[PDB]
Amino acid sequence: MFVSDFRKEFYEVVQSQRVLLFVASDVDALCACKILQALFQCDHVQYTLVPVSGWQELETAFLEHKEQFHYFILINCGANVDLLDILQPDEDTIFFVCDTHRPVNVVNVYNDTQIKLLIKQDDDLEVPAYEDIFRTMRRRQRREWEARRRDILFDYEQYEYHGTSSAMVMFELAWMLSKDLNDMLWWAIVGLTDQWVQDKITQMKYVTDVGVLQRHVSRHNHRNEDEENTLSVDCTRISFEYDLRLVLYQHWSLHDSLCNTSYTAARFKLWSVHGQKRLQEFLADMGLPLKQVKQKFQAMDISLKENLREMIEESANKFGMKDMRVQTFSIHFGFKHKFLASDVVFATMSLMESPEKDGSGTDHFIQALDSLSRSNLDKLYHGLELAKKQLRATQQTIASCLCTNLVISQGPFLYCSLMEGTPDVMLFSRPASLSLLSKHLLKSFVCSTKNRRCKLLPLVMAAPLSMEHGTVTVVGIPPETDSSDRKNFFGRAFEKAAESTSSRMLHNHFDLSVIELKAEDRSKFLDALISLLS
Amino acid sequence: MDAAEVEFLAEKELVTIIPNFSLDKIYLIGGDLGPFNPGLPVEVPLWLAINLKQRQKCRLLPPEWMDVEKLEKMRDHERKEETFTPMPSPYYMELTKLLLNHASDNIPKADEIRTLVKDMWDTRIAKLRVSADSFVRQQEAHAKLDNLTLMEINTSGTFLTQALNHMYKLRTNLQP
Amino acid sequence: LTPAELIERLEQAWMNEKFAPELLESKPEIVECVMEQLEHMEENLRRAKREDLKVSIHQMEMERIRYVLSSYLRCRLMKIEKFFPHVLEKEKTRPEGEPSSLSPEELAFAREFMANTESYLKNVALKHMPPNLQKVDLFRAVPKPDLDSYVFLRVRERQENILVEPDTDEQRDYVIDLEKGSQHLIRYKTIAPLVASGAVQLI
Amino acid sequence: PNALRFHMAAEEMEWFNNYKRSLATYMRSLGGDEGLDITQDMKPPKSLYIEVRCLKDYGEFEVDDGTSVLLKKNSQHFLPRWKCEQLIRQGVLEHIL
Amino acid sequence: QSGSTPLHLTHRFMVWNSIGIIRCYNDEQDNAIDVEFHDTSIHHATHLSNTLNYTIADLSHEAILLACESTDELASKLHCLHFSSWDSSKEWIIDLPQNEDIEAICLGQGWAAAATSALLLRLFTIGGVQKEVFSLAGPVVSMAGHGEQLFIVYHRGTGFDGDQCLGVQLLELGKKKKQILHGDPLPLTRKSYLAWIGFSAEGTPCYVDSEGIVRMLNRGLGNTWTPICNTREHCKGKSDHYWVVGIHENPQQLRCIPCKGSRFPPTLPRPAVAILSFKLPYCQIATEKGQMEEQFWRSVIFHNHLDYLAKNGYEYEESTKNQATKEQQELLMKMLALSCKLEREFRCVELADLMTQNAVNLAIKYASRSRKLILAQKLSELAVEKAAEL
């Protein structure tokens, strides 16, 4: 069932109870977890928090914890599968699901007693009616009904996508509880910006949600400040910004940010030998000295920093980059700490997807989660350093793939693969960073090629996972277009291709468009996908 | 004694809060408090004030002495005098730390308040340094430190007392 | 004695035991009264319901009071363990009606501690010693409290003609008057009756 | 821990056990029932509940009667301070914030 | 509007009362309205974009009410947010006739009222159904509501020599419609203007003039107006003055905000509500006679609300009436003792006339003590007369 009011029939229920949080390892999940943590700590709710990153891990943790806890909250996981089938719970347990994944599984939708969904009912949802999904001429009519059922269920389950941010949902709950702090609002903003950075949502939906959060920012600012008398410099001040699309440009030199932003790198073809000259054309059009552009931004001359955004916008317009400016937010506190929401997103993501072989992925999750609090600001800066390394490695990998021409058409989709032992393949072994790399690589490819048909294709990308088990991760990306809905069918396509091939596919990740394959299975699996997409 | 323990004693000081909740009078062992009426000021110990502010259950009001004009006058008087002047509170440094770190949003001009309190702290610790040096140089038998606060004494007193124990035994080792 | 003043006297004893070099005279009435107050309040909150703000506030005050009591008793036990032969000899020498430096529980602990330490030293080395040297008196081995230690104080009852003794030269001695609310830095041996009688607070 | 216990003499362990028994007897005798555990409350109390993180992969830990928490590594709980103080001092748990 | 601060400000209070605060501001960042509640259990803080430029507001436990002046293209509009409703359509909007202009609004239990530029008062249900309509006797100055009561003040004429010519109209919108006051002249200090109106939390109409004199409707004295506090005497220095936001009779509290050199407080840094005690303006008030009698009259005029609630069927705790009678009777027993020792036995009879005969028996025994024979006899005669009436 959908929860109609989070306050009464979710929060006031669990407020009297011991709770278990399962949280996915993504930045939106981390922000929603932080908001809910702060609420529970205000109300002395005895919660336990468990990270998870796949179905096997969630099943293991639930089997470990099922006896002691009756109330469970799943953040950014569980909505798009039958939780009762997967977990096999006792009937007295209750699962709250604040998950952005769409479409919601019909069993979770119509299970009234046990599965409760912390999902907005005014999100883009098209759930089929109950009578269409659940129960001689009567036999013929029944078989016709079953044919209708399979057709409508395939139409419902074909495309997966993402709804409103879980962090935004939790901040809505905090606002209804009248316990919303400025830091909670910042976590909500970072949660939305995670979806925008990873291209999980459309630009229109992102603009709408930014319009929602603008009102909350204005309310929080005018809560205790006006234009006549102001707060201490120590206090956090969140400001709406119509800022630049360039990544981490306030902590870098502008040259590095123009080099490693996927947008500008794809436009100017900076992987190519000619791309640096095109970048120099752009910089000379702006009139910025190269010794200033290659200097760190905080050390750049303030005469140049005065109107840099207008300069970059108006040069980008005539160079063909039509949407260089983006609606976003920034947070200021103290004298010297200034971050964009995209900066916090990249830092936390790099901490979580860090390639270091220390401890465990749960350890990297813990470092990422700690970095979202201002008492652990050093972790945030360290995450920014890791983001520098990650973005440089991303551009190196894209340059390698395009120069050696690993990205190759195979009919209805482009195909690419990373070989073992190549530079910085370890950084993209993990599925989430691989999905991000595939998106950036597809943007670079469609900006590079002259073939108008190839600009319309989706991308399938693979990389090694475990040589000892002989497995590869595989991800599927929809076509990269300006007006895409960011819906993709590769979940069901992978499932149906694997079933039609009897392939050894482990479906452990929460996105259905991310899978693990036994490596030798890839040839017949790819052939099946080619025959399927046709 | 640790600085956390001096803060623990400082947390007993009374401050005024404006609750956003309703609660009748509560009979604590150290003294009854309340009733807590929404939107009306009520005086509570500082630990409860900080706890309720952390739990988003009240707005803290600054003490009467957390005022930029009064604090500037106190700072100038402290710098002008040679002896330690009477401070507005016996735990002013700890009050400043707790109230400004937890409720800078409620307290206006918290930067000025913090800087003036730091000025007074620097001046009075300098005076205490001078007093310790004069004690050891002149071989005094006792000193008078009327207006020092407990945190100020605790910051430097362990070293000073140990040094004076050593000095006393050195100057008395010819007792027969 | 109202409970607020009971907690105030507890905190006074806590500070005085922190800063006094010796083990001060016991306060069994304070310990027992605070213990029964904590038991009574815990019972009342056990009767009360959960998810209640006043219950949490009472619990916080209980935590503070129990911290003060635990720290005070820990400091007294530190002094007992540090000066066990001397406090035991003082209890042996104590005249009738003079207040004891030890509670009955503390006295039992001190006797057990001294017996354990003596038996340890005996078994480990002091039975292996030569026959004449097998006995050593811990009354001589363990050092005494240093009553000449300098202490900060703040006076609560006015005093006059307190003798300040700088050093062994008697003719350098002088006298002072401790005015109400004043704070002083002075040797503990010159103010031991004052702190014992509560005229001064060590800080 | 055994790595430290290996450094002690047998008579030192005898003395330590006698001291522990004497200390527990003294702690019990401080009140009518259950005594007072003065080994707890080593620092002044700041908050009634704290958030703790499991450093060691560890067994089930009873919170109160039928309620208990599994101390698996990197799991994070919000629990009473007085229940978590001993495990923090032993290094099983990490107090955060 | 009571608890508002002037419209020319960039960032101002639209209403401050016992319920909460509404603030509005207009700046380059946004034009908006912030609603917040003293008890957060009532409702969460709410935020509205002020596109229609609402200027008058009122707040209740049941709903938020907003109104704007008419512009050329758009009429004056009445807007409401009935947040306490069970239905999801908690918002409703009404648009007035062309070139009719709202000039005041107020809320009550289940209804809303609006006074417009046609000298017209319009009643609405809190869900936005139009109830009855009638014409005001003059241009309004402000309105207030509490339960079934609707309190209106208007200009009954033109004042001269500093004074303002104000009339008061007090409707009851209950099971039978009434007018407790139907255009009576409203008292004021000389050269003053009306600063604040409203009700006590216990539902008695009250108001304050620009000289800081607080007046309350004395229902035990034929619905006249009794002063109950002079806020000027309570001030740190007489140039400054207090800005009232609420009144309570039990406990006796006057809720107000002190203002440093201003008629009203600044919007930031956020003010703190001060409590002031009520004080009847009696003579020789420092004497024991003055102390006792002023406390007696203060007690009874405040406890008139118990009679109003019981008469109109609203529930109340009988312990309040027990406490009121006990306090009044023990006080007047002490006053009787003082008058007895002063040997003014006719004054004793006058004092004891206010008492129950059971309590007068204690004064009879007190007069028997020390053999005040005439006083005892006349208190006995008073008790006999009271019993004869009873």
- A131 burial class (0-12, 13-18, 19+ CB within 10 angstroms)? exposed
Check if E251 contacts B (Cβ < 8 Å): no
> In the sheet that E241-248 helps form, which strands lie side by side, from edge to edge?
E241-248, E253-259, E274-276
CB neighbours (10 Å) of residue E231?
A: 20
- Do the Cβ atoms of B112 and B96 come closer than 8 Å? no
∠ at Cα A396 (A392, A401), nearest 5°?
150
Q: Is A240 within 8 Å of A214 (Cβ atoms)?
A: yes
In angstroms, what CA-CA distances link C53 with A325, C121, D96, E79?
A: 49, 55, 24, 38
**Gap between the Cα atoms of E297 and C36, Å rounded:** 48
Establish whether the linkage from the previous residue to C95 is cis, with ω within 30° of 0: no
Subunit contact B40:E273, Cβ cutoff 8 A: yes
How many independent structural domains does chain B possess? 2
Last residue of a domain, one of B47, B66, B85: B66
Task: Name A282's Cβ contacts closer than 8 Å, sequence gap at least 6.
Answer: A258, A268, A315, A319
Hunting for tokens 């109330």 — which residue is that?
Answer: A71
Distance from CA of B141 to the nearest CA of A (A): 46
Helix (H, G, I), strand (E, B) or coil at C127: coil
Phi, psi angle pair for A38, to nearest 5° = -65, -40
For the record, the structure tokens of E3 come out as 């608890």
Instruction: Name which of A41, A68, A360 is nearest D78 (Cβ-Cβ).
Output: A41
Report d(CA E38, CA B39) in Å as an integer: 5
CA distance B104 to B97: 10
The length of chain E, given as a count of residues: 390
How far apart (Å, rounded) are the C-alpha atoms in residues B48 and B45? 6
Report whether A480 contacts A439 (CB < 8 A). Answer: yes
Are E41 and B18 inside 8 Å of each other by CB?
Answer: no
Q: Are residues B155 and B129 in the same domain?
A: yes
> What are the residues facing E114 on neighbouring strands?
E105, E122
Counted across chains A and D, CB pairs separated by less than 8 A come out at 48
For chain E, the three-class secondary structure string (H helix, E strand, C coil) is CCCCCCCCCCEEEEEECCCEEEEEEECCCCEEEEEEECCCCCCCCEEEECCCCCCEEEECCCCEEEECCCCCCCCCEEEEECCCCCCCCCEEEEECCCCCCEEEEEEECCEEEEEECCCEEEEEECCCCEEEEEECCCCEEEEEEECCEEEEEEECCCCCCCCCCEEEEEEEECCCEEEEEEEEECCCCCCCCEEEEEECCCCCEEEEECCCEEEEEEHHHCCEEEEEEEHHHHCCCCCCEEEEEEEECCCCEEEEEEECCCCCCCCCCCCCCEEECCCCCCCCCCCHHHHHHHHHHHHHHHCHHHHHHHHCCCCCCHHHHHHHHHHHHHHHHHHHHHHHHCCCHHHHHHHHCCCCHHHHHHHHHHHHCCCCHHHHHHHHHHHHHHHHHC
Same domain assignment for residues B57 and B82: no
Phi, psi of A277 (to 5 degrees): -65, -35
Mutation choice for C interface testing from D13, D20, D21, D22 by most C CBs within 10 A:
D22
| Cβ neighbours of C183 in B, within 8 Å | 144-148, 153
Q: Kindly state the tokens that stand for A240.
A: 């709406």
Nearest in space to C183 (alpha carbons), one of C158, C159, C156, C153 = C153
CB contacts < 8 A, C to D, total 69
- CB proximity B108 to E under 8 Å: yes
* C-alpha dist (Å) from residue A402 to B90, C61, C109, C139: 71, 67, 80, 87
B99 and B160 assigned to the same domain: yes
Question: Which of E15, E19, E40 to mutate: most B Cβ within 10 Å?
Answer: E40
Q: Are residues B160 and B77 in the same domain?
A: yes
Q: Which positions ≥6 away from A409 have C-beta within 8 Å? A: A415, A454, A457
B139: left (phi over 0), alpha (psi -120 to 50) or beta: left
Domain finish residue from B66, B90, B107: B66
CATH of the domain at B100: 1.20.58.1020
Which residues, 6 or more positions from E109, have their beta carbon under 8 angstroms from its beta carbon?
A: E62, E145, E146, E147, E148
Q: Is B92 within 8 Å of B149 (Cβ atoms)? A: yes
Nearest chain A alpha carbon to D49? A44
Contact (CB, 8 A) for A204 and A67: no
Of the candidates B4, B51, B54, the beta carbon closest to that of D44 is on: B4
Residue of E80, E138, E84, E87 lying closest to E113 (CA atoms): E80
Residues B122 and B137 in one domain: yes
Q: Which residues contact A455 (CB under 8 A, 6 or more apart)?
A: A446, A449, A479, A481
Cis peptide before E269 (omega within 30 of 0): yes
| Tokens 């039978």 belong to residue | E176
Q: Which of E73, E80, E64, E89 is nearest to E14 (CA)?
A: E64
Do B60 and B71 belong to one domain? no
In chain C, what is the straight-line distance between the N-terminal and C-terminal CA atoms, in Å? 24
C27-34, Cβ contacts within 8 angstroms, sequence gap of 24 or more: C28/C103, C30/C6, C31/C69, C31/C73, C31/C103, C31/D30, C33/C1, C33/C6, C34/C6, C34/C7, C34/C10, C34/C65, C34/C69
HSE-CB for A313 with a 13 A CA cutoff? 10
Contacts for B81 with CB less than 8 Å, ≥ 6 apart: none
Q: Is D35 left (phi over 0), alpha (psi -120 to 50) or beta?
A: left
Q: Does B152 lie in the same domain as B129?
A: yes
Number of Cβ atoms within 10 Å of the Cβ of C78: 12
How far apart CA E257 and CA E244 sit, in angstroms, is 6
Q: Is A22 on the interface with D (CB under 8 A)?
A: no
**Whether residue B51 is found in the same domain as residue B110:** no
**Which residue is associated with the tokens 């006057």?**
E254
Q: How far is CA A283 from CA A277, A300, B66, in A?
A: 10, 15, 53
C63 shares contact with chain A (CB less than 8 Å): no
Are the C-beta atoms of B33 and B26 separated by less than 8 Å?
yes
| Burial zone of A288 (CB within 10 Å; 0-12 exposed, 13-18 middle, 19+ buried) | buried
Is residue E232 within 8 A of residue E238, CB to CB? The reply is yes
Measured distance CA(D82)–CA(B66) in Å, rounded:
35
- Shortest Cα–Cα distance, A366 to chain C (Å): 30
d(C-alpha E116, C-alpha C114), whole Å: 93
Q: Do B5 and D44 touch (CB under 8 A)?
A: yes
User: Percentages helix, strand, coil for chain D, rounded to the nearest 5?
Assistant: 35, 25, 40
Q: Which residues pair with E35 in a beta bridge?
A: E22, E46
For residue B166, count CB atoms less than 10 angstroms from its CB and return exposed for 0-12, middle for 13-18, buried for 19 or more.
exposed
Candidates B1, B8, B53: best to mutate against D (most CBs of D within 10 A) is: B8
Helices and strands (H, E) in chain D, number of each type: 3, 5
Strands (E), chain C: 150-155, 159-164, 174-178, 183-187, 200-202
- Domain match, B26 and B74 both: no
Long-range contacts of A194-197 (CB under 8 A, 24+ apart): A194/A26, A194/A27, A194/A28, A194/A31, A194/A165, A194/A167, A194/A345, A194/A349, A195/A28, A195/A100, A195/A162, A195/A165, A196/A342, A197/A342, A197/A345, A197/A346, A197/A349
- What is the spatial distance between Cα E168 and Cα E152, in angstroms, rounded to a whole number? 6
- The 8-class DSSP code of residue C26 comes to P
Two tokens, residue A135:
């129960």
Sort out which chain B residues have CB atoms less than 8 A from E255's CB and list them: 40
Cross-chain residue pair D70–A366, CB shorter than 8 Å: no
Q: Does B144 touch chain C (CB under 8 A)?
A: yes
CA distance C94 to C97: 8
Instruction: Judge: E11–A219 Cβ closer than 8 Å, yes or no.
Output: no
Question: What does the alpha-carbon distance between residue B30 and residue B28 come to, in Å, rounded to a whole number?
Answer: 5
Q: Which residues of chain B does E269 touch, with a Cβ-Cβ cutoff of 8 Å?
A: 108
Interface test with A, best of E37, E47, E86, E267 (most A CBs within 10 A): E47
Name the one residue in this structure whose structure tokens are 């059971």.
Answer: E358
Method for structure elucidation: cryo-EM
Residue D51 has φ and ψ, to the nearest 5°, of: -100, 130
C18 vs E166: CA distance, rounded Å: 72
* Domain limit, last residue, from B15, B31, B66: B66
C-alpha R_g of chain D: 16
- Say if the Cβ atoms of C56 and A44 lie within 8 Å: yes
Both B74 and B61 in one domain: the answer is no
- Phi/psi of residue D17, each to 5°? -65, -40
Which residues does residue C151 pair with via DSSP β-bridges, in sequence order? C186
Instruction: Residue C120: list chain D partners with CB under 8 A.
Output: 11-12, 14-15
Residue A23: both structure tokens together: 């949280």
Classified as helix, coil or strand, A273 is: coil
Same structural domain for residues B48 and B71? no
Q: Does residue A358 contact residue A278 with C-beta atoms inside 8 Å?
A: no
Which residues have CB under 8 Å from E31's CB, separation 6+? E25, E49, E50, E51, E53
Chain D and chain E touch, per 3+ beta carbon pairs within 8 A? no
Backbone break loci in chain D, preceding residues, C–N > 2.5 A: none
> To one decimal place, what's the resolution in Å?
3.2
Which positions in chain C touch A16 (Cβ < 8 Å)? Answer: 51
Nearest CA to D43 out of C64, E177, A225 is that of C64
What gap in Å lies between CA C157 and CA C193, rounded to an integer? 13
Q: How far is CA E196 from CA A145, C188, E199, E203, E302, in A?
A: 71, 66, 10, 16, 19
- For residue C40, the distance in angstroms to the closest alpha carbon of chain D comes to 11
What is d(CA A5, CA A224) in angstroms, rounded to the nearest whole number?
Answer: 29
Residues B87, B118, single domain; the answer is yes
Q: Which of B76, E332, A68 is nearest to D64 (CA)?
A: A68
Report the DSSP beta bridge partners of residue A462.
Answer: A417, A474
Q: By residue range, what is the domain housing residue B139?
A: 67-175
Residue B146, min C-alpha distance to chain A (Å): 34
Beta strands A47-52 and A19-24, pairing class: parallel
Substitution target in A44, A46, A372 with the highest count of D β-carbons within 10 Å is: A46
Sequence-separated contacts (24+) of E326-331 with Cβ below 8 Å: E327/E299, E328/E296, E328/E299, E328/E300, E329/E355, E329/E356, E329/E359, E331/E292, E331/E295, E331/E296, E331/E299
In our burial notation (b when 16+ CB lie closer than 10 A, e otherwise), range A16-30 reads eebbbbbbbbbbbbb
The CATH number linked to B59 is 3.40.5.50
Query: Which token pair is A156?
Result: 């419902």
Burial class (CB in 10 A: 0-12, 13-18, 19+), B148: buried
